[PDB]
Short mmCIF file of C-alpha atoms in Angstrom, two decimals:
data_model
loop_
_atom_site.label_atom_id
_atom_site.label_comp_id
_atom_site.label_asym_id
_atom_site.label_seq_id
_atom_site.Cartn_x
_atom_site.Cartn_y
_atom_site.Cartn_z
CA UNK A 1 -0.04 -0.19 -0.29
CA UNK A 2 1.28 3.34 -0.55
CA UNK A 3 -0.35 5.82 1.65
CA UNK A 4 -1.25 9.73 1.12
CA UNK A 5 0.35 11.67 3.40
CA UNK A 6 -2.81 12.69 5.50
CA UNK A 7 -4.04 9.33 5.35
CA UNK A 8 -0.79 8.23 7.07
CA UNK A 9 -0.95 11.19 9.48
CA UNK A 10 -4.41 10.03 10.49
CA UNK A 11 -3.49 6.26 11.17
CA UNK A 12 -0.49 7.71 13.06
CA UNK A 13 -2.70 9.64 15.15
CA UNK A 14 -5.04 6.75 15.79
CA UNK A 15 -2.12 4.59 16.82
CA UNK A 16 -1.03 7.37 19.51
CA UNK A 17 2.06 8.64 17.68
CA UNK A 18 0.94 12.45 17.98
CA UNK A 19 3.38 13.67 20.47
CA UNK A 20 4.36 10.21 21.50
CA UNK A 21 7.55 10.69 23.89
CA UNK A 22 7.48 14.69 22.62
CA UNK A 23 7.67 13.87 18.78
CA UNK A 24 5.14 15.74 16.73
CA UNK A 25 2.80 14.10 14.15
CA UNK A 26 4.65 15.83 11.58
CA UNK A 27 8.17 14.39 12.28
CA UNK A 28 6.67 10.89 12.18
CA UNK A 29 5.05 11.47 8.80
CA UNK A 30 8.55 13.19 7.48
CA UNK A 31 10.11 10.17 8.80
CA UNK A 32 7.80 7.98 6.55
CA UNK A 33 7.95 9.87 3.42
CA UNK A 34 11.71 10.19 3.15
CA UNK A 35 12.43 6.62 4.68
CA UNK A 36 9.90 4.55 2.27
CA UNK A 37 8.09 7.48 0.04
CA UNK A 38 4.98 5.96 2.17
CA UNK A 39 5.19 2.65 0.72
CA UNK A 40 4.34 -0.14 3.41
CA UNK A 41 6.27 -2.78 1.06
CA UNK A 42 9.53 -0.98 0.91
CA UNK A 43 12.69 -2.77 1.70
CA UNK A 44 16.10 -1.96 1.19
CA UNK A 45 18.71 -5.01 0.87
CA UNK A 46 21.62 -3.81 2.63
CA UNK A 47 25.29 -4.73 1.44
CA UNK A 48 26.04 -6.13 5.17
CA UNK A 49 22.89 -8.60 4.11
CA UNK A 50 20.36 -7.18 6.70
CA UNK A 51 17.02 -5.73 5.55
CA UNK A 52 15.22 -2.48 6.21
CA UNK A 53 11.49 -3.23 6.50
CA UNK A 54 8.21 -1.17 5.75
CA UNK A 55 6.87 2.32 5.92
CA UNK A 56 9.28 3.48 8.61
CA UNK A 57 12.54 1.08 7.34
CA UNK A 58 12.94 -0.68 10.30
CA UNK A 59 16.00 -2.72 10.17
CA UNK A 60 16.24 -6.57 10.88
CA UNK A 61 19.82 -7.06 13.09
CA UNK A 62 18.15 -5.79 16.22
CA UNK A 63 14.27 -5.35 15.90
CA UNK A 64 12.51 -8.30 13.97
CA UNK A 65 13.11 -11.93 13.44
CA UNK A 66 13.90 -12.41 9.51
CA UNK A 67 14.22 -16.07 10.45
CA UNK A 68 17.79 -16.25 10.02
CA UNK A 69 18.62 -16.21 14.14
CA UNK A 70 15.34 -17.06 16.27
CA UNK A 71 15.83 -16.62 19.84
CA UNK A 72 18.49 -13.68 19.05
CA UNK A 73 17.43 -9.93 19.43
CA UNK A 74 14.12 -9.28 17.65
CA UNK A 75 13.11 -6.24 20.59
CA UNK A 76 9.82 -5.83 18.66
CA UNK A 77 8.99 -9.24 19.12
CA UNK A 78 7.57 -9.82 15.55
CA UNK A 79 8.61 -11.31 12.27
CA UNK A 80 9.85 -8.79 9.88
CA UNK A 81 6.96 -9.73 7.51
CA UNK A 82 4.72 -7.70 10.08
CA UNK A 83 6.68 -4.61 9.21
CA UNK A 84 5.44 -5.28 5.63
CA UNK A 85 1.75 -5.24 6.00
CA UNK A 86 -0.41 -2.59 4.59
CA UNK A 87 -1.79 -2.00 8.05
CA UNK A 88 1.15 0.09 10.03
CA UNK A 89 -0.11 -1.70 13.42
CA UNK A 90 3.17 -3.48 13.91
CA UNK A 91 5.58 -0.78 12.67
CA UNK A 92 4.23 1.76 15.12
CA UNK A 93 4.29 -0.22 17.86
CA UNK A 94 7.97 -1.19 17.10
CA UNK A 95 8.61 2.48 16.17
CA UNK A 96 7.82 3.37 20.00
CA UNK A 97 10.22 1.14 21.10
CA UNK A 98 12.96 2.71 18.79
CA UNK A 99 12.50 5.88 19.44
CA UNK A 100 12.80 5.21 23.12
CA UNK A 101 16.16 3.49 22.63
CA UNK A 102 18.50 6.46 23.39
CA UNK A 103 18.73 8.42 19.81
CA UNK A 104 15.38 9.61 19.39
CA UNK A 105 14.04 9.85 15.76
CA UNK A 106 17.92 9.93 14.83
CA UNK A 107 17.44 5.92 14.70
CA UNK A 108 15.66 7.08 11.14
CA UNK A 109 18.88 8.17 8.83
CA UNK A 110 16.14 9.82 6.13
CA UNK A 111 14.49 11.71 9.21
CA UNK A 112 17.92 12.97 10.20
CA UNK A 113 18.99 14.41 6.42
CA UNK A 114 15.66 15.68 5.41
CA UNK A 115 13.42 16.18 8.48
CA UNK A 116 15.58 17.36 11.42
CA UNK A 117 15.85 21.11 11.79
CA UNK A 118 12.80 21.45 9.63
CA UNK A 119 9.39 23.14 9.92
CA UNK A 120 7.58 19.40 10.17
CA UNK A 121 4.18 21.11 10.77
CA UNK A 122 4.25 21.33 6.97
CA UNK A 123 3.75 17.74 6.82
CA UNK A 124 0.37 18.05 8.36
CA UNK A 125 -0.77 21.05 6.72
CA UNK A 126 -4.05 20.64 4.99
CA UNK A 127 -4.67 17.37 6.82
CA UNK A 128 -7.23 19.11 9.39
CA UNK A 129 -7.42 16.44 11.62
#
């Protein structure tokens, strides 16, 4: 599924991300724009052999089980396949863990490079949620 910008804002708001740990909804929408272009099926086959999955490009080394090493890591307690669903539940719940892990939203490289330091309120302009 490719979300519209305000469609994703509404979904993320329903899942309690607006101002979660102090990060504004526009931060989360901007992150999804530059991580995945709002595509729930996004994948990035890294050179190191790990994969970033889904609308927030969550990495398989730490956060999900890709089938290669069960009983190891998997800090979000989900198969990486859950990050590829058209419904954002698993990605939101796992993003809440990541953003609490001590680097805030600097855990998302595309957020750091394209959103950080900007007026991210623009990402919810016109959504009038």
